[PDB]
């Protein structure tokens with residue numbers, strides 16, 4: 069009874085997803101026929117339909133009798149929502165001030181985007197864990213339309229190389245440099261906001277809808293120092309050669325300690341004798357993006373010449389990142405089902421390390437993008453698609469693993 | 480206890496899959512660095528490792544005490560195995576006879592391919608439903624290595640445009656034309672053999688490892704006539720203009736009858752009051768390839784000019800194919816949980832229609848490939864990847880739906 073309408077809402081969602089994916093892919097492949105303005109028209113129609121549905125929800129569905137995690141997904145949702153609203157404000161200011169020889173087309177589509185980020189954030193803040201009871205089949209089609217729009221927006225954010233190559237054409241002055249800097253710096257925030265919204269809307273139509281801290285704090289402070297140094301050097305010019313080595317050597321100092329600590333915690337777990345499935349599949353599927361991008365990096369270094377200074381640091385960094393993802397995944401999946409104090413230090417050290425490793429890969433001009441090594445191997449558009457597919461998924465993995473390791477810490 | 484080693488075998492499989500996918504994708508993108516011979520070396524090492532494991536299985540694992548669907552997967556497995564052995568024989572004869580100015584490199588890699596298709600078919604014929612009990616963790620790593628090799632072989636078969644554009648370069652004489660004709664005609668057989676093997680190896684490490692017929696026969700005979708007419712015209716020259724219209728008009732006659740019959744069967748189902756989950760996800764995931772390819776076709780026609788003779792037949796054919804997939808899926812998913820005789824006629828008519836619609840899209844020069852409409856819209860390599868991703872999945876859907884509708888027929 070429920071699963072049948074669930075299937076029908078899924079058919080609506082898959083038809084909208086595959087139609088929009090055909091439009092976006094025709095924008096990638098056959099660029100002369102399908103224009104980005106047509107994709108914006110389709111996504112604007114779809115966004116306005118989601119606006120009418122969530123407005124009808126907030127005004128006339130949430131008032132009849134319905135049925136009678138919660139701290140970090142909501143906070144990251146408001147954070148990434150605020151920064152994506154700011155990103156679209158930066159895009160509007162980039163549209164209106166420098167290039168004044170335009171029509172009124174490229175201002176309306178980010179304005180509906182601003183409105184859509186705003187009221188979806190307000191709607192997902194309050195109405196997340198509330199099992200809808202009055203209008204089942206309308207709510208499932210509405211939520212699946214919203215998920216389809218978020219997936220099409222994420223796909224456009226992944227494969228949209230248009231402004232990112234347009235900005236770097238002029239780079240080959242008073243406020244337009246501020247606007248370009250802010251747009252490039254804030255571009256992963258919308259791409260990860262789409263994934264956060266997809267996760268919480270999926271939850272609310274699937275289930276809903278029927279000593280150690282001292283070293284950890286030292287790691288967080290040194291990570292903040294190298295991150296602010298790389299970001300100050302990065303948004304001032306084409307940054308440097310040595311700051312790459314500094315960032316990657318911070319990675320090669322931190323990540324083997326996390327591998328060794330995760331392996332030790334796994335041995336301690338061997339020395340002692342629905343929600344869990346969604347947590348497992350979220351951890352694995354979020355790990356796959358960074359594992360895939362780093363395997364592309366491994367092949368891209370060993371096919372070219374290794375044994376340069378930082379070029380050996382990217383290789384070792386990628387291999388240690390794979391190994392850290394794997395051992396940390398084994399540690400978390402084993403952890404969800406003199407010893408206890410040691411394991412508490414392990415878990416809180418990994419929590420603080422995951423927080424500083426969460427804040428770092430979401431700020432635009434990342435050093436896995438800003439080398440001429442994977443670029444001019446796969447190419448700009450291909451490596452842009454790989455990086456924007458992988459790095460928001462690594463941010464999602466860091467968030468979800470912060471939650472899992474905080475559950476381990478109070479276990 | 481079991482799920483942990485299951486996870487570890489999955490880590491081995493995902494590492495091999497992502498490493499080989501990085502090699503194949505570097506062959507697509509950075510063609511100057513990674514050569515197809517290196518992909519053949521990697522797949523040959525991987526194939527030989529699977530050969531040693533399955534030979535050790537057949538000779539020294541299947542003899543200790545183990546634990547104490549079956550008619551069409553096995554038959555299609557032997558059929559596609561025989562035709563892929565024949566395809567690799569055709570590839571060897573294409574390698575050795577026409578282009579004699581070669582080294583001994585391109586003969587060994589199809590020879591290990593022939594041996595690998597042969598003994599995997601022999602191994603999957605007898606040892607499919609036998610729960611292995613003696614060497615658990617070795618068998619899981621072996622089966623996951625074999626699944627990783629089959630997925631990498633399927634990915635190379637999907638994205639391997641190399642010979643298919645090489646053959647059509649000379650087309651711009653005694654036996655090399657026979658060899659090229661047979662290779663192009665038999666190329667989907669290996670690509671669908673890989674998916675059949677992936678499905679049965681996935682089963683044997685997942686669960687194992689711990690009146691109406693008269694019109695249906697008329698449809699089958701007329702489908703055989705239009706298929707043999709298109710194949711005789713197709714492998715004689717660049718075929719015709721009118722045979723496309725004949726094939727697509729057979730589709731536009733047959734598929735609305737299947738939509739109407741599936742909708743009627745759904746209404747009759749509304750008028751009466753593990754394995755199932757794998758069947759559902761196999762039906763949906765096999766449907767997604769044809770639904771995606773036809774949505775690409777819909778966008779490719781409506782972005783260019785419709786309202787030509789057969790160009791309106793491809794559009795209506797694609798929309799009716801989407802609608803037939805959707806209504807037949809609704810019919811099968813409802814069917815798995817004066818009236819009974821009518822529903823029996825519905826099910827057997829759809830069985831015979833699915834058999835003739837199973838034999839048709841697996842024979843090479845397909846009319847969804849052989850128009851200059853989606854080609855020169857997406858391009859040869861892109862549309863080749865789309866067609867070889869979609870059409871073996873449609874063959875898999877037709878097979879799996881023949882099995883499901885035969886279960887419905889005796890229900």
Ligand SMILES: CC(C)CCC[C@@H](C)[C@H]1CC[C@H]2[C@@H]3CC=C4C[C@@H](OC(=O)CCC(=O)O)CC[C@]4(C)[C@H]3CC[C@]12C
Pocket residue numbers: 071072074075077078079081082085089219223759763767812
């Ligand atoms: C990343 C983008 C570019 C592609 C992702 C596509 C998905 C967004 C679509 C395509 C297939 C769709 C699924 C197709 C089938 C179903 C099964 C359906 O489940 C049932 O069949 C319940 C009925 C029953 O169990 O009998 C639930 C919706 C769902 C997952 C759909 C949800 C949305 C999916 C995953």
Ligand SMILES: CC(C)CCC[C@@H](C)[C@H]1CC[C@H]2[C@@H]3CC=C4C[C@@H](OC(=O)CCC(=O)O)CC[C@]4(C)[C@H]3CC[C@]12C
Pocket residue numbers: 348352356401482483485486488489490492493496500630634
């Ligand atoms: C088509 C190609 C290019 C990409 C396909 C990638 C897959 C071949 C890989 C990537 C993710 C891998 C999966 C990652 C995680 C797991 C979960 C694991 O299941 C468990 O976690 C059991 C333990 C538990 O339940 O607690 C089983 C292996 C599996 C499916 C792996 C099997 C192989 C997968 C699907």
